[PDB]
Design an enzyme around this catalytic site. Structure first.
Site, PDB file in Angstrom:
ATOM      1  N   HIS A   1      -1.223  -3.303   4.836  1.00 51.20           N
ATOM      2  CA  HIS A   1      -1.410  -2.832   3.463  1.00 51.20           C
ATOM      3  C   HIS A   1      -2.717  -3.325   2.835  1.00 51.20           C
ATOM      4  O   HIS A   1      -2.940  -3.106   1.635  1.00 51.20           O
ATOM      5  CB  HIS A   1      -0.210  -3.220   2.592  1.00 51.20           C
ATOM      6  CG  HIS A   1      -0.128  -4.680   2.262  1.00 51.20           C
ATOM      7  ND1 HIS A   1       0.768  -5.529   2.873  1.00 51.20           N
ATOM      8  CD2 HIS A   1      -0.804  -5.431   1.361  1.00 51.20           C
ATOM      9  CE1 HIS A   1       0.629  -6.745   2.375  1.00 51.20           C
ATOM     10  NE2 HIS A   1      -0.318  -6.713   1.456  1.00 51.20           N
TER      11      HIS A   1
ATOM     12  N   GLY B   1      -2.647 -12.659  -2.789  1.00 52.33           N
ATOM     13  CA  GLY B   1      -3.665 -13.004  -1.824  1.00 52.33           C
ATOM     14  C   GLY B   1      -3.198 -13.904  -0.703  1.00 52.33           C
ATOM     15  O   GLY B   1      -3.986 -14.191   0.207  1.00 52.33           O
TER      16      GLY B   1
ATOM     17  N   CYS C   1      -0.883 -13.017   1.396  1.00 51.75           N
ATOM     18  CA  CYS C   1      -0.493 -12.178   2.521  1.00 51.75           C
ATOM     19  C   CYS C   1      -1.442 -12.400   3.692  1.00 51.75           C
ATOM     20  O   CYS C   1      -2.639 -12.636   3.509  1.00 51.75           O
ATOM     21  CB  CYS C   1      -0.482 -10.706   2.109  1.00 51.75           C
ATOM     22  SG  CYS C   1       0.848 -10.293   0.960  1.00 51.75           S
TER      23      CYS C   1
END
Lengths: 300, 300
Positions: A41, A143, A145
């Site tokens: 993503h 952030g 991820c």
């Protein structure tokens, strides 16, 4: 000697963290050999996340649309592909810090260490457990991820988790390093249920054994029980059923303490039925289920 | 986004850990530049530890009596001296992995990360707080001495703790990197008392603010109090008195939540007087005091 929630040393994993940026979306990547792994993503805008078609969105991207930076040096992307829910960006430079590693899919109830990262820079380390409902209770801001969970066995790093999303209950969900989500979750901004969470029974017993090894014994009583009798109480309190495999795994702890597993089950049963009456166990007023038997054997 | 006890990344510290052996006594050493720092009781036999004269015992030792091993390479000891309770072994090779570092003496109530090591090899990382009675609640088996506590500011490692001993209450004591013990303890195998431990009040408030940031608000009431009225209740429960400096440090958290510090003091007073009624806060049924305000700001 004390008993603490203890994460693995993070040095081998720190040298693998990079920053990945597509458009204005930035997250963390895992750089091993000549490939960088990160959540897919990263290619989505804020609006794309509401209902993304990842195959259509990725088609609009080419190699030069991915900016990978390791510290201050910029890696050149020479290839890209989607594997389930992760992107694999092939780069022209092999990571010289690549440790011996493997990808593993961890089982529910097992633990691992998380190296929380932001903008490709390590922030902190902590130990998590894969809940029976395939969520984790970590600390992940925006952030974070791309942060990875891992175990270390000697010299080999077993990567098992990559962070993708936060659930409305405040818990987190992610994938293995092949991009397959743990649990029923999908990488889309929509309400998703994790389902009833269970207590990892064998982990509670291992933690109760750790307490006895450290001198905490007030919860021990004169009763014993049977496997089927304790499980009738386990099912009632949303504990996992205890099996003979669990009894065998607790073998080293039962031998060290001289307390039979079924004797400890009777003490846990009393703790479940009567509570803790304002006392504490290993500095906790709750029953801890995020220590595996192997974790306890490592510290005691 | 979650709230967890989170240790600093340990990579910079892992590269500094060595093994120091004197006779059969083996513990951990800290290798920075061309000096190795370790607890001075490495020169003691089991009998010496009962009542050691360290100056007399060290005089019987020469450079070649200290075996320093960094992984598999043997460092050559070209000098040795005693500084309070640590030994400084000068070696012929500067540690190529020496990070930017400084030695600090930490204040009570502050937190740091511990890299637990055995035989010079890192085993795990966890966060600790220097208790008001100058002990810590860690996880230290035999051979863990020489493990260090540290904080990371950007690129700089502030070493503040080196582990020396375990107290009869199950808590631990050590020195700064100049060899001065925190608290009244001495490195001798004799019964020693730590004194009444206090609860770090400003840390409890910071953790209560962390809970509100994460959506836990049941403990908030419609009362307020005064600094002197709360401190009359703090002293009763062996809490530290709250000062205006503490109120100022909680400023960022009070601003983010819109809850005045004295308003949060009233909820804590009611939690102290009434208990938690079987409920939990951030997954804990006890009031946690090992998160500093800075620790909370970092994760929130």
């Amino acid at each position: 000697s004390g008993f603490r929630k203890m994460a693995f040393p993070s040095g081998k994993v720190e040298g693998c963290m990079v920053q990945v940026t597509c458009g204005t979306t930035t997250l963390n990547g895992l750089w091993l050999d000549d490939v960088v792994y990160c959540p897919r993503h990263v290619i989505c805008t804020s609006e794309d996340m509401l209902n993304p078609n990842y195959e259509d969105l990725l088609i609009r991207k080419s190699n030069h649309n991915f900016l990978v930076q390791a510290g201050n040096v910029q890696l050149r992307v020479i290839g890209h592909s989607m594997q389930n829910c992760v992107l694999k960006l092939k780069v022209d430079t092999a990571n010289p810090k690549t440790p011996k590693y493997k990808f593993v899919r961890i089982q529910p109830g097992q633990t691992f260490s998380v190296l929380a990262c932001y903008n490709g820079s390590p922030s902190g380390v902590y130990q998590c457990a894969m809940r029976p409902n395939f969520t984790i209770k970590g600390s992940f801001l925006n952030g974070s991820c791309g942060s990875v969970g891992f175990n270390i066995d000697y010299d080999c790093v077993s990567f098992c988790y990559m962070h993708h999303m936060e659930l409305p209950t405040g818990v987190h969900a992610g994938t293995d390093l092949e991009g397959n989500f743990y649990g029923p979750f999908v990488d889309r901004q929509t309400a998703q249920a994790a389902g009833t969470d269970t207590t990892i029974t064998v982990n509670v017993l291992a933690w109760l054994y750790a307490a006895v090894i450290n001198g905490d014994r007030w919860f021990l009583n004169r009763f014993t029980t049977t496997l089927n009798d304790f499980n009738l109480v386990a099912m009632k309190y949303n504990y996992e059923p205890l099996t003979q495999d669990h009894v065998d795994i607790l073998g080293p702890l039962s031998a060290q303490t001289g307390i039979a597993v079924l004797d400890m089950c009777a003490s846990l049963k009393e703790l479940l039925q009567n509570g803790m009456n304002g006392r504490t166990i290993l500095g906790s007023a709750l029953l801890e289920d995020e220590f595996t038997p192997f974790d306890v054997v490592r510290q005691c």
